[PDB]
Amino acid sequence: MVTAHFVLIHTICHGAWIWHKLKPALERAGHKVTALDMAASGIDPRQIEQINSFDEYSEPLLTFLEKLPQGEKVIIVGESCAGLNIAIAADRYVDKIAAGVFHNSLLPDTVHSPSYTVEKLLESFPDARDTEYFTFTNITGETITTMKLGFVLLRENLFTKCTDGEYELAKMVMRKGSLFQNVLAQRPKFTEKGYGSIKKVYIWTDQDKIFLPDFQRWQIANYKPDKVYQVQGGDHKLQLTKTEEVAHILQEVADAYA
Amino acid sequence: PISKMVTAHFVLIHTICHGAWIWHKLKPALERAGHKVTALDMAASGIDPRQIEQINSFDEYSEPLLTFLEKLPQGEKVIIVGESCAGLNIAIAADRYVDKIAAGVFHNSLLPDTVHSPSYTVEKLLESFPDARDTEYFTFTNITGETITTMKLGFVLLRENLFTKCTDGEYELAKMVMRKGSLFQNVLAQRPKFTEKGYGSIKKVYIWTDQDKIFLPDFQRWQIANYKPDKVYQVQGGDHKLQLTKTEEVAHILQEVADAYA
Amino acid sequence: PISKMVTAHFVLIHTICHGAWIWHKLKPALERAGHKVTALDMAASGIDPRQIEQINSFDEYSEPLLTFLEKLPQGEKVIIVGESCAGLNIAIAADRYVDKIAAGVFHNSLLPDTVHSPSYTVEKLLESFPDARDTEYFTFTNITGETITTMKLGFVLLRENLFTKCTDGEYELAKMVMRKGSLFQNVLAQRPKFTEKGYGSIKKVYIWTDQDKIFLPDFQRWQIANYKPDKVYQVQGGDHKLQLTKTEEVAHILQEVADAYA
Amino acid sequence: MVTAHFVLIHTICHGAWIWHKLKPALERAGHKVTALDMAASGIDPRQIEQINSFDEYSEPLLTFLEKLPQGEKVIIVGESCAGLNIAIAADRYVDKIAAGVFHNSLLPDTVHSPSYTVEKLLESFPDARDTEYFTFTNITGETITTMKLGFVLLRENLFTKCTDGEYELAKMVMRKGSLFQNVLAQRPKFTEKGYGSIKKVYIWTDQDKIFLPDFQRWQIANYKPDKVYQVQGGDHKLQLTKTEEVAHILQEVADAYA
Ligand SMILES: O=Cc1ccc(O)cc1
Ligand SMILES: O=Cc1ccc(O)cc1
Numbered sequence A, D: 001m002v003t004a005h006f007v008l009i010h011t012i013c014h015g016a017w018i019w020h021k022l023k024p025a026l027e028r029a030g031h032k033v034t035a036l037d038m039a040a041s042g043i044d045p046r047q048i049e050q051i052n053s054f055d056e057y058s059e060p061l062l063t064f065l066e067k068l069p070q071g072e073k074v075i076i077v078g079e080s081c082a083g084l085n086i087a088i089a090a091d092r093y094v095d096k097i098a099a100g101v102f103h104n105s106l107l108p109d110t111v112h113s114p115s116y117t118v119e120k121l122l123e124s125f126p127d128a129r130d131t132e133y134f135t136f137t138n139i140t141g142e143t144i145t146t147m148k149l150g151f152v153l154l155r156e157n158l159f160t161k162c163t164d165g166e167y168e169l170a171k172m173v174m175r176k177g178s179l180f181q182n183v184l185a186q187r188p189k190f191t192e193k194g195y196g197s198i199k200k201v202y203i204w205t206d207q208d209k210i211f212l213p214d215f216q217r218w219q220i221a222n223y224k225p226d227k228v229y230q231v232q233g234g235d236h237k238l239q240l241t242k243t244e245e246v247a248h249i250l251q252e253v254a255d256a257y258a
Numbered sequence B, C: 001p002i003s004k005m006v007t008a009h010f011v012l013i014h015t016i017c018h019g020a021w022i023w024h025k026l027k028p029a030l031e032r033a034g035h036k037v038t039a040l041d042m043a044a045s046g047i048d049p050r051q052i053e054q055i056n057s058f059d060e061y062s063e064p065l066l067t068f069l070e071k072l073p074q075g076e077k078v079i080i081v082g083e084s085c086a087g088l089n090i091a092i093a094a095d096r097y098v099d100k101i102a103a104g105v106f107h108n109s110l111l112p113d114t115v116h117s118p119s120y121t122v123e124k125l126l127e128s129f130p131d132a133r134d135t136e137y138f139t140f141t142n143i144t145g146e147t148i149t150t151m152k153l154g155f156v157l158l159r160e161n162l163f164t165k166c167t168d169g170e171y172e173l174a175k176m177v178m179r180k181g182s183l184f185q186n187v188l189a190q191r192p193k194f195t196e197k198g199y200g201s202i203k204k205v206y207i208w209t210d211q212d213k214i215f216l217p218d219f220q221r222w223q224i225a226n227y228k229p230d231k232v233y234q235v236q237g238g239d240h241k242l243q244l245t246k247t248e249e250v251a252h253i254l255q256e257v258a259d260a261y262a
């Protein structure tokens, strides 16, 4: 129906590998799909300790968008923390973006600080259970906290309904990550002209065991998307547990925003 | 008359360019059987942080395995399962840790011997499959001035020759985490041959399929003839990646190896 | 009838692409006179660790100066000496820290005003010296989507136009530590004009040479006419880098500024 | 007389800038001169915490030598710690090297560990006075110690006889550095075939106040150079205090090893 170019953006600690089932699904319907590793994620060669902000973390997306041929538009699909990558990119390249799709994701706004929905998530889900934390100082002196996600947290909260083959893959390639929360606290808010203006579709499930229903419904209330699609069942990783559902919603988004 | 059923500790070793991720389906399957499974990334592979140009030989590339074997508890032994190039990792390990190894399992793998140079099956492999299609090759000079050839495996070769029968989610995953690799063939060529007392003495099981489109039947059959395995299991069907296309067959064969040697 | 001789705290601000290193001869010369001297690297300049593509405006580029002025002890004031593009750093600083500034000294420098847009003297500079010879230009998109032009100054332009009369050890040093820079001219163009109460109110001394081969006599004389300095000192001879070709003349003029305003 | 291509290698914490007086001197005699910043040194964009060994630190030299046109040979001149960069490079590219020149430098050998002369230096000069130290963990878990050289140490020991303009420049551009001593302890010794075979000229002064006469004479005794030139007076930075003397010795080395 409309075929589109989708750019898929994994969350912190993960990599382009999280989209290994969704990328062929979309390509079966004629779409062009780009799945990117953000800095220090997946097989990106940088280590997290050399990344100094969330905007530097987003560099693979911003370079890609910088090079997109004149006149092409993409649909950026972001899971979990990647809603901050969509907002950073949309402020810089608003006219290359047909729409932002948030998949059980942070939905930033223009009214509060960039770290605001991170504050809210951590308030809703304050214990990362067996996750380990570490810190380093970034090049301007700020202390950055990194984490290594715990495998119990991975099995029960993130990959709740995923097959054993998928959970095992997650453990074999997961890397350290950081919210850069304090640097986000200090960041200028997202602009109305860029991020504020793009089309926004929010996909979620009430069976998510880490972005809990109440936080997700709060986000929607706080900055109402153009469209909200609720998938029944699945878990936090709907691109693994409800792959054909997400491919179908994404076809609707290509039909609507081309 | 008496049936023995054994649970074992398998250490799964991926081939160059790949990582521990290739075992993401066989590791749960083995654990369903009650076995202990360790799947290691070798240097500059999977999410190991080193880059391949910092590595100077196939022995250095094998460090995660040797370090692991160094740390095994006293009197604990493992079954090392190696795919494709990983039979050289099994030979390097067995020459340092022979008493920690219950058996070596070669899965569509290089089967080194003690009679010829370490690079001998690598040469015969390349003589049998000389066109790597869209693979790109690169060079770096190692710590003593040897030029090392690395490669980024091409995606058609990946689709058709390595992952022939794998699902699209599996082939897409490969493309998403595949890294550069090196056979270090010229440095293997100058390396001491594997020993009889270490590697020559371990039990050796050869699993293969004649539908493999990269380690071809004639090369695999030659390897078996060149250096007789203690046991050979030929899986019907599948492709080079039997741990993805025939996961349960492979897990069952590995139950039989544990019953015999672990 | 009464002679006043004053020791002062000078803060020396390099121009884009350069760093605190350009002041390596004037800083000892001033300290011989008993003054306190701070020479700061601005963002992405000298050995500051940020890269220029992480910087989004000339105000962000000025952060080391504003942070420094924020930390000055209560009732301490400094004389800010800025070379070439650094007169915009002096104007940005004076609009935040006017009471910490005894005087601004412009050394073959841009002389911003309050009447026109912040980018106005930048435009007139470029209109007067439009061919940057072998300079290479580059682009990046900043945090709100503006395209920022950066440059790597060419070595002939460096030899002949900026460092015309400098020794070879000095010109070689420049080539060894020179970094990319940006005028952020389009973002300066959208910026609020400098204020009368802050920048408009500071004392302003203009040091220049008519032998400057990049900020030419006609541009410098126009600046002086456009916005009358409190005092003008014209050094005979030298080149654009008077802190290297006329270090002692410059230190003596700066002693006179300290005597008058510090 | 013979004109040559010299590649100049600064020591840890410094950069190509330390050669700003020697490079024009040599170019006045017809030589081609390349002065390189090693990783995380001078204006190299890497931070020291992302460097994991002394061989990785040497990468600018090894890339340069990797690209040298076929048939060209260079004379590598190394000051202070840069004798370890000459030995690492010579093991990899022995045939591109006309000779190694050690300027008040570590002179490694093939008989003991790579860290051996570092052990010896630190035994001769155990107190770095106001130098500050720091540590980070490298990508394989080793703890690396870095330092920020103290300005008293800089003025009295390293830049003893340098002009005030030169000492001030040193303070304006000095960076953190590391000996990677423990990783050097673990490194295979330098080979006889590579490093062991190159021509070696040792330049020094007895007025050096940090590589003291007794350590320098020990080094010469421990691995006798092909030629030792002793400059009278000056300080540790003879390329600043005795620039024309060093340019003259280097002309002799081009005449002798071409
Ligand atoms: O989506 C991944 C994620 C990880 C850690 C957090 O703290 C928040 C989100
Ligand atoms: O609170 C920690 C956290 C970790 C991973 C997530 O995906 C979300 C939150």
Ligand SMILES: O=Cc1ccc(O)cc1
Residues within 6 Å of the ligand: B015, B016, B017, B083, B084, B085, B181, B183
């Ligand atoms: O087993 C993977 C492999 C890759 C490249 C080769 O040349 C040979 C084998």
Ligand SMILES: O=Cc1ccc(O)cc1
Residues within 6 Å of the ligand: B084, B126, B129, B130, B131, B132, B162, B214
């Ligand atoms: O000949 C190249 C080659 C590449 C990958 C393999 O797995 C085997 C051989």
Ligand SMILES: O=Cc1ccc(O)cc1
Residues within 6 Å of the ligand: C015, C016, C017, C083, C084, C085, C181, C183
């Ligand atoms: O003062 C340095 C300078 C560099 C580039 C310019 O375009 C203008 C000035």
Ligand SMILES: O=Cc1ccc(O)cc1
Residues within 6 Å of the ligand: C084, C126, C129, C130, C131, C132, C162, C214
């Ligand atoms: O026109 C470019 C230019 C470059 C460097 C300067 O210092 C001044 C102008």
Ligand SMILES: O=Cc1ccc(O)cc1
Residues within 6 Å of the ligand: D011, D012, D013, D079, D080, D081, D179
């Ligand atoms: O030559 C610089 C140097 C710095 C620190 C050391 O510990 C040794 C050498």
Ligand SMILES: O=Cc1ccc(O)cc1
Residues within 6 Å of the ligand: D080, D122, D125, D126, D127, D128, D149, D158, D210
């Ligand atoms: O002992 C520390 C040290 C520092 C700088 C040097 O140049 C030599 C040694």
